[PDB]
Amino acid sequence: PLPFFPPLYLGGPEITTENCEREPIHIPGSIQPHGALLTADGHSGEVLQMSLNAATFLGQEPTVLRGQTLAALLPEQWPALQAALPPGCPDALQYRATLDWPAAGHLSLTVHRVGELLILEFEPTETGPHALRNAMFALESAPNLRALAEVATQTVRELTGFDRVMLYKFAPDATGEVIAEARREGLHAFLGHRFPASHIPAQARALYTRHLLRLTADTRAAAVPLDPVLNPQTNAPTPLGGAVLRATSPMHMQYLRNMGVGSSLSVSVVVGGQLWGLIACHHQTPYVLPPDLRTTLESLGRLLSLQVQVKEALE
Amino acid sequence: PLPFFPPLYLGGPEITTENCEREPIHIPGSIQPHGALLTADGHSGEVLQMSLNAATFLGQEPTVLRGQTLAALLPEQWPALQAALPPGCPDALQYRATLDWPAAGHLSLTVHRVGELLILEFEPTETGPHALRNAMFALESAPNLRALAEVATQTVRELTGFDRVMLYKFAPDATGEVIAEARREGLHAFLGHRFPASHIPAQARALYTRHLLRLTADTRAAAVPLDPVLNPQTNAPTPLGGAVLRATSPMHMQYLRNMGVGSSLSVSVVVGGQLWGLIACHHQTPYVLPPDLRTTLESLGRLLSLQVQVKEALE
Ligand SMILES: C=CC1=C(C)/C(=C/C2=[NH+]C(=C\c3[nH]c(/C=C4\NC(=O)[C@@H](C)\C4=C/C)c(C)c3CCC(=O)O)/C(CCC(=O)O)=C2C)NC1=O
Ligand SMILES: C=CC1=C(C)/C(=C/C2=[NH+]C(=C\c3[nH]c(/C=C4\NC(=O)[C@@H](C)\C4=C/C)c(C)c3CCC(=O)O)/C(CCC(=O)O)=C2C)NC1=O
Numbered sequence: 001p002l003p004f005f006p007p008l009y010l011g012g013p014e015i016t017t018e019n020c021e022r023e024p025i026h027i028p029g030s031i032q033p034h035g036a037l038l039t040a041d042g043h044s045g046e047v048l049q050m051s052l053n054a055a056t057f058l059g060q061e062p063t064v065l066r067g068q069t070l071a072a073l074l075p076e077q078w079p080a081l082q083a084a085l086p087p088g089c090p091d092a093l094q095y096r097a098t099l100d101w102p103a104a105g106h107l108s109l110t111v112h113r114v115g116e117l118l119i120l121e122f123e124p125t126e127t128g129p130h131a132l133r134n135a136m137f138a139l140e141s142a143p144n145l146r147a148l149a150e151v152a153t154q155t156v157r158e159l160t161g162f163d164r165v166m167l168y169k170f171a172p173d174a175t176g177e178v179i180a181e182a183r184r185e186g187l188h189a190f191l192g193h194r195f196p197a198s199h200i201p202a203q204a205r206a207l208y209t210r211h212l213l214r215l216t217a218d219t220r221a222a223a224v225p226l227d228p229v230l231n232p233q234t235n236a237p238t239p240l241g242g243a244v245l246r247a248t249s250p251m252h253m254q255y256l257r258n259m260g261v262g263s264s265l266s267v268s269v270v271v272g273g274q275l276w277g278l279i280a281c282h283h284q285t286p287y288v289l290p291p292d293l294r295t296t297l298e299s300l301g302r303l304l305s306l307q308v309q310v311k312e313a314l315e
Numbered sequence: 316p317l318p319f320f321p322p323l324y325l326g327g328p329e330i331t332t333e334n335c336e337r338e339p340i341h342i343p344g345s346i347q348p349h350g351a352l353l354t355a356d357g358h359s360g361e362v363l364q365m366s367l368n369a370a371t372f373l374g375q376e377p378t379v380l381r382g383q384t385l386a387a388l389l390p391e392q393w394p395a396l397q398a399a400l401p402p403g404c405p406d407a408l409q410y411r412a413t414l415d416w417p418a419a420g421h422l423s424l425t426v427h428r429v430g431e432l433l434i435l436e437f438e439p440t441e442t443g444p445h446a447l448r449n450a451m452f453a454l455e456s457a458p459n460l461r462a463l464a465e466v467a468t469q470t471v472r473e474l475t476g477f478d479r480v481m482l483y484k485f486a487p488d489a490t491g492e493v494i495a496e497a498r499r500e501g502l503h504a505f506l507g508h509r510f511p512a513s514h515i516p517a518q519a520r521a522l523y524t525r526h527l528l529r530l531t532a533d534t535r536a537a538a539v540p541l542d543p544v545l546n547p548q549t550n551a552p553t554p555l556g557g558a559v560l561r562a563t564s565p566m567h568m569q570y571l572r573n574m575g576v577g578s579s580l581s582v583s584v585v586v587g588g589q590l591w592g593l594i595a596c597h598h599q600t601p602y603v604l605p606p607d608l609r610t611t612l613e614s615l616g617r618l619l620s621l622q623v624q625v626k627e628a629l630e
Contacts, residue, residue, distance in 0.1 A: 090452050134408055134409060295444055296444065299447065302455075306621035
């Protein structure tokens with residue numbers, strides 16, 4: 001696509017349907033409000049940026065967290081984290097831990113590394129893996145690509161309870177077609193419907209080849225800024241493509257609301273390094289899919305990508 | 316292979332190195348002693364056979380369990396179980412549940428269906444899924460088949476803590492070669508070693524194309540008979556290939572002991588319906604890998620099988 005615009009917080013232009021492939025969706029400087037996010041120096045563990053809602057989840061004010069080390073804040077996790085995510089590791093690699101907190105359930109921690117920055121996501125939480133193991137039989141025995149697609153969408157709907165699960169296949173002109181769909185009874189079918197390339201613009205497609213799962217938990221929820229908004233290491237925006245908490249493009253959020261969607265999630269299907277399609281999910285109401293279920297969906301995405309390649313080779 | 320012999324309990328001949336492809340390894344009429352096994356009628360749920368150690372795990376004598384229904388014994392699981400495993404479903408499909416019991420941890424239940432028979436395995440129990448999600452990056456980026464194999468064996472060793480993990484590839488003459496190995500420091504290497512076809516005889520290879528994971532938790536542990544040994548539905552032996560608790564061939568157990576192996580496990584690598592190889596694991600001491608970790612290994616096996624097919628196609 002044409003080069004990204006600056007984000008709105010650096011004085012960038014408003015997004016319209018004439019320029020929307022230039023929206024810098026990877027650097028919104030904000031997150032979805034169902035979790036908290038910190039960034040930290042990869043070597044010292046010093047906390048550099050904090051979502052403004054951090055006190056809700058972490059029990060300290062953003063301004064007080066700023067500058068504290070992960071050695072101090074997360075003493076039991078820091079050495080494991082530092083060892084798990086060495087300089088130069090893939091930016092999609094994750095360190096995951098479970099933390100205790102005063103509320104019901106636990107606090108899930110997911111960390112990844114971009115350059116010299118660690119990006120930490122904290123998300124409250126509280127059969128899928130075995131369900132996936134079982135589904136692999138029907139995915140394997142599917143005789144062809146479309147049969148595979150039909151199995152896959154039904155499997156994902158069974159795993160998640162999403163109201164609608166589609167397999168959305170890209171054509172070479174970047175238009176799409178819904179080639180399989182599993183949906184709650186009552187819902188109008190999108191099966192067989194085709195859509196222009198504009199709905200998933202080129203910078204989104206590029207991001208989705210690198211970071212294979214993204215979501216909008218609540219399509220009416222206001223984003224929460226990061227502070228400071230720029231990474232002090234670089235005095236430049238923080239890449240958030242690897243964080244599921246990344247704020248969704250407002251353009252896409254409006255699209256989803258217009259479609260009657262309360263929660264959205266997709267998983268990339270990538271074949272030979274190319275974006276083949278998406279497992280695209282909708283719910284009618286807000287829905288935060290727990291981290292362990294997302295992990296199952298990522299694993300299914302990888303499986304499905306390989307099966308697509310093998311079943312297409314049958315032709 | 317030549318037709319199977321009758322098992323020893325039906326007066327079959329002793330197994331030697333001259334006839335060992337005829338050992339009926341799928342119908343040993345016995346199980347490994349770290350769990351219990353029941354069989355039940357698929358329609359009524361009546362318990363038909365019981366491992367002789369059942370009281371250790373279930374708290375009722377085999378003779379008292381015999382004839383009771385799963386509706387009575389497992390009231391909370393029976394309808395789910397019956398719905399999960401309908402007549403004609405794949406014999407590899409599993410129903411899994413967690414049961415409470417008086418000892419520490421829980422009792423894992425795994426059920427599968429062969430014909431009109433349900434086969435129930437009960438096994439005491441007490442990060443892998445996410446570890447597998449992470450490993451998928453390195454498996455995908457592996458440039459070729461051997462690199463993939465090296466990643467896979469290291470991944471499995473990381474997931475399991477097994478002393479030795481090999482990728483054992485079958486040649487068209489059914490000889491094998493260790494093409495990758497991850498092993499604890501101190502252990503002599505089998506990397507690159509080749510082995511005659513006799514070590515994994517043709518009936519074993521056939522079974523391993525249908526039931527993709529098997530193990531011996533303790534290579535010195537005596538098997539526990541099923542009683543009655545024949546399925547009353549058929550007045551014939553009960554197929555146990557789908558049960559991880561199935562007793563291992565005594566010939567193989569002796570091989571493992573001679574090799575200094577205390578616990579063994581393998582996962583089939585199946586490509587286009589053909590047995591390509593095994594992920595073959597050893598431990599120096601007895602080791603019962605928990606059901607959820609086995610599930611992760613099954614999922615890795617499926618992934619790896621697909622990656623083998625894709626990486627081989629690069630040639
Ligand atoms: C049944 C039909 C159907 C379709 C066609 C569909 C499309 C779709 N769009 C997606 C994403 C984005 N779209 C746009 C931009 C625009 N979209 C427009 O229509 C115009 C107005 C526009 C700009 C002028 C942007 C910037 C993003 C990136 C969002 C981000 O990651 O921050 C996603 C993936 C995310 C997800 O799964 O929820 C999907 C699956 N989902 C459906 O169910
Ligand atoms: C480093 C080298 C190396 C090798 C070569 C190796 C082989 C191997 N044999 C396997 C299984 C069986 N073998 C035999 C029979 C015989 N085997 C023999 O040698 C002669 C004496 C013989 C009969 C005369 C039978 C009936 C079975 C089925 C067991 C069952 O499923 O009940 C397995 C899979 C099971 C597992 O992972 O533990 C493996 C991986 N495992 C290694 O580590």
